[PDB]
Amino acid sequence: NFRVQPTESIVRFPNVTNLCPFHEVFNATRFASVYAWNRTRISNCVAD
Amino acid sequence: NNATNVFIKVCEFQFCNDGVYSSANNCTFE
């Protein structure tokens, strides 16, 4: 049997626009003490 | 839901019997 080998491999995924506020927790100035730490809910985000 | 959009949340949701909810624990997926 004869086949044409694929010319190239292309991977395509849906464009992501979750944009989790990682920048929002990386520019804050009013950080509190150590014993009182948030538990920020990283939900329906993108791990960028 | 309401007039212009929808409101989906996953919280404790104690009770309304009628600002429907009056509790907030492990509030995820707004």
Curated annotation (Swiss-Prot), chain A:
It comes from the Viruses. Glycans are attached at T7, S9, N15, N27. Residues 3-19 are annotated as: Disordered. Disulfide bonds join C20-C45. Attaches the virion to the cell membrane by interacting with host receptor, initiating the infection. The major receptor is host ACE2. When S2/S2' has been cleaved, binding to the receptor triggers direct fusion at the cell membrane. When S2/S2' has not been cleaved, binding to the receptor results in internalization of the virus by endocytosis using host TFRC and GRM2 and leading to fusion of the virion membrane with the host endosomal membrane. Alternatively, may use NRP1/NRP2 and integrin as entry receptors. Binds to host ACE2. RBD also interacts with the N-linked glycan on 'Asn-90' of ACE2. Cleavage of S generates a polybasic C-terminal sequence on S1 that binds to host Neuropilin-1 (NRP1) and Neuropilin-2 (NRP2) receptors. Interacts with host integrin alpha-5/beta-1 (ITGA5:ITGB1) and with ACE2 in complex with integrin alpha-5/beta-1 (ITGA5:ITGB1). May interact via cytoplasmic c-terminus with M protein. May interact (via N-terminus) with host bilirubin and biliverdin, thereby preventing antibody binding to the SARS-CoV-2 spike NTD via an allosteric mechanism. This is Spike protein S1. It comes from Severe acute respiratory syndrome coronavirus 2. The chain holds residues 317 to 364 of 1273 of the full protein.
